[PDB]
Amino acid sequence: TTSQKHRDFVAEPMGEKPVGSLAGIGEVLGKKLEERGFDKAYVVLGQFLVLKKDEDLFREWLKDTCGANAKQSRDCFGCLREWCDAFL
């Protein structure tokens, strides 16, 4: 299943939404992503696209970059994958 946060994200263009609008990215992860330059959701989309939408490599990058656990990286990947299927 998915959260409402996921459904809200995949339903519309992301524009300049902050990184915290991604499913899985709560306060703590969002801070650490901002510290490393990923301050908006589209920058994380960028990394997902550079990695050619590879689930294992993206989720591993997210863990390495901000400490996302398995649930959090699963949620974040899923919302970017579904967003891309709808809008890219």
Add this chain to the structure above:
Amino acid sequence: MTTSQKHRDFVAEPMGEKPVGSLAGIGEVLGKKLEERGFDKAYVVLGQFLVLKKDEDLFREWLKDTCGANAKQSRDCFGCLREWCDAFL
């Protein structure tokens, strides 16, 4: 309109799995060098554009370093991605 028809076709619709050569400024020569470096679909180049926070200087330099794009090619590619993002992102 002063943009190319090729820019117009790209920015008119979602890019899906379009190849890198669908981007304005990316002819066959630049497209082959990009593919060889792993940037084989236009969305992978969009990805680099987004990871660079849409910065023109950083992106155009990256494009020069990666495939040897000249100034006009890199401006055209950047402008096509910038307008695509304004339309769809």
